[PDB]
Amino acid sequence: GRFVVWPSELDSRLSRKYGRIVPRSIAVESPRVEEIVRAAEELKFKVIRVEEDKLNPEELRTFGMIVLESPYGKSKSLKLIAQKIREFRRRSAGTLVP
């Protein structure tokens, strides 16, 4: 259905109390809004709206939200998005370790 994606929800750097929803091993480090949008697009989700606000200032320096429509539930959608981002980054780096 339609739901919002907040980068913290799939960020492996974070604890669950602080917002991570996705299992630790599936989550990716510092998911960027642009990465989430591209992942959603590759998964053929419909991107409704993207908001990104960067303000000169700590943890509130960056704000980002993506409104998506997916054929799947939010939890499954988030897992697929996280996996797609990992795949993206690996493709670009072309290497496993630094």
Residue numbers in the entry: 2 to 58, 65 to 105
Sentences reproduced from the published study:
As SRP binds to signal sequences emerging from the ribosomes, the resulting complex composed of the SRP and the ribosome-nascent chain complex is then targeted towards the membrane through the GTP-dependent interaction with the membrane-associated SRP receptor (SR also named FtsY in bacteria). We describe the X-ray structures of SRP54 and SRP19 the two protein constituting the proteinaceous core of the SRP from the hyperthermophilic archaeon Pyrococcus furiosus. SRP54 and SRP19 constitute the conserved core in all archaeal and eukaryotic SRPs.
Two molecules of SRP19 associate in a dimer with an extended β-sheet surface built around the anti-parallel association of their respective β2 strands. Observation of the crystal packing in the orthorhombic subunit reveals a tetrameric arrangement between symmetry-related molecules that is similar to the one observed in the monoclinic form. Pfu-SRP19 is characterized by a more extended β-sheet due to longer β2 and β3 strands when compared with all other available SRP19 structures. The structure is also characterized by two loops (L1 and L2). In contrast the L1 loop remains structurally unchanged, this is observed even when all available structures of free and RNA-bound SRP19 from different species are compared.
